Every structure is written in structure tokens, then in C-alpha cells.
């Protein structure tokens, strides 16, 4: 294991959530992940154990406020009368799943969203579609790129369902089958991917269900630049997000030999999240580093 | 009916961990307790509420590492 990221570098991540259906999640993100990371690296003592309760209060505040945008179908959108967003509903599931360890979260809100995604937004071929893009295109990270959207979005949604599985297993009968179908889609087109971003995000999705191996794993690994990062010509934030998904995949594979260089690269970026368009990069870099701290030998 | 057993187990797990939390008052114990409770079936909505309230009260007292 490597040294943890100094808690002092993350004090700006304790934020007050505000705005509508999308903006509330943009504010909720940094706080949830900061607490998640500080919890795992146990830096509260050497930082302010009382600040945690405060952060928790802000998370509860974000959660309740998000419920005002839960539509009758269990889906989410910037406004209750706006067509529901596949990506946002999936992201809400993603964030709430990690926050299950911090505050009370209604399983039916989480699993209701999961059920809606499966029943309403998944094609018979396994693909997940977005029929009402979020207003804040800057909050979806690398998924903003139009190329390989079916793979990228399907991977993103699959990740959410996978992280929600433990919580929703007993109440969403179709969950297992949905995941299988999504995986099948990713598998049949993985070798054809051209973007390091899609390779990384889809790689993690496949790795979680033990399907990242053989030539797929070879593709995933060889896509990395200097064996320490997954990048494409574009915003650096997308590469930080991509490489974070890649780290999570490697951890899932237990490939601790390939891990050190990746973690070193991420730390060397000295990216501490926050700010316009940082949502995916902030959530992912810290989810990935926290997981690293938790698993890595 | 293994589901009946699973659900009862989750409830047992949640109860133990919540009790453990009331004992130690640590972040680690808080997290396990909170997630455990989250896993308790709606079938036990009442004790689930009672268990959540117990978590909320331990936090009101303050954590210690």
C-alpha cells in the first residue's frame, strides 16, 4: 500500500447540496465521497471527528432534497415533470449505494430506481438507453463524448446495478438477469472499442462479474499508456475518471502487480476534486483510492 | 422459504451490529451498523425503524475514533 491522500487536501469537498434534481447530486457527490474516503483511511481523528457528523448532516440534507425529484415511477430528472433521465437515475443509485454506510436510505427508493432502469430503459439485447439527457452534461464525465455511447452508458448503468445488488437482491427478481444481459452486450463489443475511456469503464463492469479475461483482459491491460494510465485526447478530467475506473477493475481482478504504477500516477496528478465538471472525476478517483486502501496488500 | 431465513439473518446481523455500535461508538462500527440495517427487509419496517433510531441516538452522543 501507498501513503493515503492528506485529509487537509479534501476539506473543500464538504459541500452544501442545493439546486434541482441534477445540481443537488452535483453538491451531494463531493461530500459523500469525501466522508467515504476519510472513513476508509481513518483520518477523522487527525482532522476533526466532529466535522464528520456535520458532513453526515449535509448528506442527509442532500438525500431528502433529492427525494423531492423522485418521480412516481421511481426515476429521477432535474424537475419532477421533466422526462426521467437514465443516466441520472443510475447515478442516484450509484451515489446512494455508497452512502448506505453513512445515513438511512430507503431501500425502496434505491431498488425502485433499479427496477425502473431494468423494466423501462434496458433493451432486449442488454443495452441501456438515455431518452432524456441531463441538462448538466458536464456532470456525466467522459460519457459526454458521443462515440461508443451504448457501451459507455451500458457499462455505467451496469456498474450502478452491481453496486446496488447487495441492497436490492431480495426485492428485484430481475436484477440478476439484467446484469447478465448487460454483460453480454459489453462482452460482444469490447474487442471493438477504440476509446481508452470505454475500455476502462466497461472493463470495470466486466471485471465485477468475472468476465474480464482472455483477450478482453489483454485488450484492457494493453490499452493503458506506460502501464499506469488510461487516456484519450480530450479533457484531462476524463482520463482521471477513466484511470480510476481502471484501478477499480484491477482491484476487482486482484492484479496487485499492475496496481502500484496506476495508484502512483493518480496521486501524482494531485487531483483533489471539486468544481465545475468535476462530478465523475471526484466520485471515481476517491472511490478508487478508497478501494485501493481497503484491498491492496 | 430460505428467503425467510435470509431475512431473519439480516435482522439478526443488524441487531447485533447495532448493539455493537451502541457499545463502541466508532466510525467503523457505525458504518457496519448502518449498512446492516439498510439490508433489513421492509417486512420488519417497525424494528428497522427502531434500529435506525438506535443508530441515530448513538451518533447524537458522539463518536470516538
The verdict on a CB contact (< 8 Å) between B31 and A102 is yes
Resolution in angstroms, to 1 decimal, for this deposition? 2.1
Q: Rounded CA gap, B26 and B9, in Å? A: 23
How far away is chain A from the Cα of B23, in angstroms, using its nearest Cα? 18
Closest to A117 in 3D by CA, of A106, A107, A127: A127
Can you tell me the distance from the alpha carbon of A208 to that of A94, in angstroms, rounded to the nearest whole number? 15
Shortest Cα distance from B28 to chain A (angstroms)? 8
Give me the CATH code for the B1-65 domain, please: 1.10.10.1270
What's the CA gap between A116 and A112, in Å, rounded? 6
The answer to whether the Cβ–Cβ distance between A108 and B38 falls below 8 Å is: no
- The CATH number given to whatever domain includes residue A117 is 1.50.10.20
Cα-flanking dihedrals φ and ψ of residue A122, to 5°? -100, 130
- Contact yes or no for B38 and A170 at CB 8 A: no
The secondary structure of residue A122, as a DSSP letter, is B
Q: For residues A263, A197, A199 and A130, what is the CA-based torsion angle, rounded to 10 degrees? A: 130
Please choose, from the candidates A55, A66, A53, A60, the residue with its C-alpha nearest in 3D space to the C-alpha of residue A26. Answer: A66
> Domain spans of chain B?
1-65
* Sign of the dihedral defined by the CA atoms of residues B3, A94, A297, B21, in that order: negative
Count how many domains chain A has: 1
Rg (CA), chain A: 18
Contact between A36 and A102 (Cβ < 8 Å): yes
Contacts of A56 in chain B (CB under 8 A): 59
For the record, the C-alpha cell of A36 comes out as 467515504
Give the residue on A whose Cα is nearest the Cα of B4. A170
Pair A60, A106: CB distance under 8 Å: no
Method: X-ray
- Grid coordinates representing A113 are 430506481
Residue A128 DSSP class: B
Which residues span the domain enclosing A1? 1-297
- Count the Cβ atoms, other than its own, within 10 Å of residue A262: 24
Q: Cell numbers 442516484 correspond to what residue?
A: A92
Amino acid at each position: 500500500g501507498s501513503r493515503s491522500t492528506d485529509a487537509e487536501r479534501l476539506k473543500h469537498l464538504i459541500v452544501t447540496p442545493s439546486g434541482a434534481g441534477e445540481q443537488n447530486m452535483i453538491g451531494m457527490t463531493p461530500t459523500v465521497i469525501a466522508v467515504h474516503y476519510l472513513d476508509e483511511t481513518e483520518q477523522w481523528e487527525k482532522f476533526g471527528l466532529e466535522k464528520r457528523q456535520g458532513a453526515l448532516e449535509l448528506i442527509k440534507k442532500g438525500y431528502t432534497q433529492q427525494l423531492a425529484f423522485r418521480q412516481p415511477s421511481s426515476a429521477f430528472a432535474a424537475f419532477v415533470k421533466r422526462a426521467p433521465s437514465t443516466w441520472l437515475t443510475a447515478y442516484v443509485v450509484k451515489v446512494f449505494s455508497l452512502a448506505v454506510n453513512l445515513i438511512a436510505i430507503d431501500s425502496q427508493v434505491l431498488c425502485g430506481a433499479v427496477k425502473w432502469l431494468i423494466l423501462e430503459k434496458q433493451k432486449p439485447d442488454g443495452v441501456f438507453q438515455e431518452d432524456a439527457p441531463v441538462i448538466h452534461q458536464e456532470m456525466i464525465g467522459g460519457l459526454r463524448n458521443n462515440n461508443e455511447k451504448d457501451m459507455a452508458l451500458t457499462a455505467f448503468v451496469l456498474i450502478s446495478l452491481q453496486e446496488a445488488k447487495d441492497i436490492c437482491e431480495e426485492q428485484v427478481n430481475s436484477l440478476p438477469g439484467s446484469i447478465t444481459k448487460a454483460g453480454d452486450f459489453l462482452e460482444a463489443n469490447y474487442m471493438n472499442l477504440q476509446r481508452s475511456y470505454t475500455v476502462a469503464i466497461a472493463g470495470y463492469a466486466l471485471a465485477q462479474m468475472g468476465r474480464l479475461k482472455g483477450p478482453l483482459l489483454n485488450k484492457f491491460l494493453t490499452t493503458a499508456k506506460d502501464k499506469n494510465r488510461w487516456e484519450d485526447p480530450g479533457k484531462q478530467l476524463y482520463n482521471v475518471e477513466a484511470t480510476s475506473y481502471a484501478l477499480l477493475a484491477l482491484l476487482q481482478l486482484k492484479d496487485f502487480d499492475f496496481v502500484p504504477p496506476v495508484v502512483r500516477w493518480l496521486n501524482e496528478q494531485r487531483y483533489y476534486g471539486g468544481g465545475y465538471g468535476s462530478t465523475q472525476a471526484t466520485f471515481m478517483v476517491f472511490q478508487a483510492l478508497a478501494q485501493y486502501q481497503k484491498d491492496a496488500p | 422459504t430460505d428467503a425467510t431465513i435470509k431475512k431473519e439473518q439480516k435482522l439478526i446481523q443488524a441487531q447485533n451490529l447495532v448493539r455493537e455500535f451502541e457499545k463502541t461508538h466508532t466510525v467503523s462500527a457505525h458504518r457496519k451498523a448502518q449498512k446492516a440495517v439498510a439490508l433489513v427487509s421492509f417486512e420488519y419496517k417497525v424494528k428497522k425503524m427502531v434500529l435506525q433510531e438506535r443508530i441515530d441516538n448513538v451518533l447524537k452522543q458522539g463518536l470516538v475514533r
